[PDB]
Design a protein around this nucleic acid. Structure first.
Lengths: 427, 229
RNA sequence: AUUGUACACGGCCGAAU
DNA sequence: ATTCGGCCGTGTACAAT
């Protein structure tokens, strides 16, 4: 006999120069992108992108290059540009790196390399090198051959324009009705070990911007790095804004689950106490720890008209810590709704909080409006990952970095390399 | 419309007070049947109340955390002929061999598995949860293998055979391989029907008999009200 | 690795005292 | 220590504009 509530219709995509792009409509989003450029057009010194591969005069690669030109020149507005081909002719990673060294020496700002096979070690070992220096996009030929290259290269180039330091899209989330500084978390389990990352959010321009990311942290240092990050986010927020933490200082934990006391919440409470003892955060500060989980024994029959699946916003429980939230509604195609397999909704649980139960119900939705607002923020394709960007992005960072370190590749870190911030590289 | 069937089947009726014989914890406490260890005690609810004869009310703190395993242990009794409970504990493992003339059935056997769970909210309402998980089993060997694990072995074209059959029985995809419309509705009609013919009650509700009172399950998904507040 | 959504396995990591 | 809830990896497929 629970009760579910829906976020009021909105969250229209903004891509700069004004926008009215809806959500869950890839056709409409790409139509807007062709009509209106991306949020921050990532023009660079060398208006020239290379495509590095092994094929020679293959019609498929030629069609790929023609599509890349006709789209990035018209849909992503990185103008005054041309696509150059580089050939390594030997699937060994050393030959490929030697070939991409030619593109680096030329100075091309974008490398859309094509691998021949599904080869994990070489893929990650070379992605480390070709991501810690230049925006790029490693892809492979086996899966390139099979499916249509329209729907393929569209998302390919969305990820590409995101990696070029620009922003494909931004969401219409108000400066109010949100958390000023969200420190999200994700994890990736390698050899039964959790590796954590934090997608710090600062509200750089009044709209929730993933401003800077953090490297992998083992669970042993998870709490200490969380304290350091609580301090760093308020430092950066004060530096970039003369405002105060009036609404919240929440978190977003996935891949783990925080404690009620003597753990994540105690660290957050103590560090917020330290911040308020130095006038940095307002007295009416809200800690609002959280926990996010994707797999669980729960499912939902949505309304039958919407392919029996729950709509884009639902909060089914009340007065309990756990809540459920639906994000992936079926895509609204020209004929109707996309036929979809049964989907598993995201479960939100407020592990600990200190709203003192006066307007607790208001602030539960105040967080939960944000996560549905913060989940379509991710820039990896025309499709969302049904996790907040503060959960998707740390997960991707941890996966990429753990894979790179497992194979002994070129080390990556977003702390030492200052240029990695506000420039998606981990996608 | 405006309702989200939440995979919960309500406990429409259950004893207002359940006779729970609280016992100080003892180090050799097996997980056992009809015994729950919440806090630092052992609560010999139901079968085994010969010590205290105690009664625990609805609003008591221990009631909510004892009646969960009480309900699991009383649901682990009345099960129909085909199904076979596998394991009991935090959840109940109800499996059932599949016989639906799926293509290449003589090589790999499919196995419905039911995940019996239970959720309590507001301390005055209850309900059981179900989740399905088909198990891939080679009928001649009865071991756990994956679609990639078969590959060319057991037939390369049979990957298109069990997988399509798996998503068809699971009601995610068509029996041929493509995708259909009412995947979500059939995803739970299957769960409700499977539980109904699993607990040996083709009727809407089964009135299980407990040492305390009578437990009745609506066997229907918990409707969620469209309250906005 | 265009993206997701699912899926089956393998291994499981952690909430509450 | 138990109860109880998840939880992310590697490979099949499916389909969007």
């Amino acid at each position: 006999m629970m009760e579910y509530k829906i976020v009021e219709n909105g969250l229209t995509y903004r891509i700069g120069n004004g926008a009215s792009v809806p959500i869950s409509n890839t056709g409409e989003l790409i139509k807007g992108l062709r009509n209106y450029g991306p949020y921050e057009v990532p023009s660079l010194k060398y208006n020239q992108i290379a495509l590095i591969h092994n094929n020679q005069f293959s019609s498929l690669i030629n069609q790929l290059k023609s599509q890349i030109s006709s789209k990035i020149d018209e849909v992503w507005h990185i103008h005054n540009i041309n696509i150059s081909e580089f050939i390594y002719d030997s699937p060994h990673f050393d030959s490929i790196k030697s070939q991409v060294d030619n593109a680096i020496d030329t100075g091309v700002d974008g490398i859309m390399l094509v691998l021949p096979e599904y080869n994990t070690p070489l893929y990650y070992k070379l992605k480390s090198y070709l991501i810690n220096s230049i925006p790029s996009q490693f892809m492979r030929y086996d899966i390139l051959s099979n499916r249509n290259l329209t729907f393929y290269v569209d998302n390919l180039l969305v990820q590409f324009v995101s990696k070029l330091g620009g922003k494909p899209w931004i969401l219409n989330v108000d400066p109010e009705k949100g958390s000023d500084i969200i420190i999200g978390t994700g994890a990736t389990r390698i050899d039964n070990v959790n590796l954590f990352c934090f997608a710090m959010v600062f509200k750089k321009d009044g709209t929730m911007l993933w401003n800077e990311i953090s490297p992998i942290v083992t669970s042993s240092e998870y709490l200490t790095y969380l304290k350091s990050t609580i301090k760093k986010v308020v430092y950066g927020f004060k530096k970039s804004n003369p405002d105060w933490d009036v609404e919240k200082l929440t978190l977003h934990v996935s891949g783990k689950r925080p404690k009620m006391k003597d753990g994540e919440t105690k660290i957050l409470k103590e560090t917020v106490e330290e911040l308020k003892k130095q006038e940095m955060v307002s007295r009416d500060v809200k800690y609002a720890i959280l926990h996010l989980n994707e797999t669980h024994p729960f499912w939902v029959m949505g309304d039958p008209n919407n392919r029996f699946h729950p709509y884009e916003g639902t909060k089914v429980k009340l007065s309990s810590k756990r809540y459920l939230l639906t994000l992936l509604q079926p895509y609204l195609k020209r004929n109707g709704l996309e036929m979809v397999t049964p989907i598993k909704p995201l479960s939100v649980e407020i592990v600990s909080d200190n709203w003192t139960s006066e307007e607790y119900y208001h602030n539960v939705h105040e967080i939960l409006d944000e996560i549905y607002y913060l989940s379509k923020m991710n820039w990896r394709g025309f499709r969302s990952r049904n996790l907040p960007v503060t959960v998707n992005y740390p997960k991707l960072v941890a996966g990429i970095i753990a894979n790179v370190n497992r194979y002994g590749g070129y080390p990556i870190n977003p702390e030492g390399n200052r240029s990695l911030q506000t420039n998606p590289w981990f996608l | 419309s405006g309702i989200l069937y939440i995979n919960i089947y309500p406990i429409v009726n259950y004893p207002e007070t359940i006779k729970v014989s609280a016992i100080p914890y003892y180090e050799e406490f097996l997980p056992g049947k009809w015994k729950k260890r919440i806090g630092d005690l052992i609560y010999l609810y139901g079968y085994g109340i010969e010590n205290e004869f105690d009664e625990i009310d609805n609003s008591n703190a221990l009631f909510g955390k004892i009646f969960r395993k009480y309900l699991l242990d009383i649901l682990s009794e009345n099960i129909a002929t085909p199904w076979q409970l596998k394991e009991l504990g935090s959840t109940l493992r109800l499996v059932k061999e599949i016989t639906e003339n799926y293509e290449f059935s003589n090589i790999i056997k499919l196995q419905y598995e039911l995940i019996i769970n239970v959720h309590h909210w507001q301390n005055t309402n209850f309900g059981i949860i179900v989740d399905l998980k088909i198990n891939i089993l080679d009928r001649e060997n009865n071991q756990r293998i994956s679609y990639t694990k078969i590959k060319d072995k057991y037939g390369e074209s049979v990957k298109k055979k069990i997988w399509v059959s798996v998503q068809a029985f699971h009601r995610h995809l068509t029996p041929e391989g493509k995708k259909y419309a009412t995947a979500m509705r059939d995803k739970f009609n299957l769960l409700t029907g499977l539980l109904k013919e699993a607990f040996g009650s083709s009727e809407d509700e089964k009135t299980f008999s407990t040492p305390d009172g009578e437990i009745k399950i609506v066997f229907k998904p918990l409707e969620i009200v469209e309250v906005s507040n």
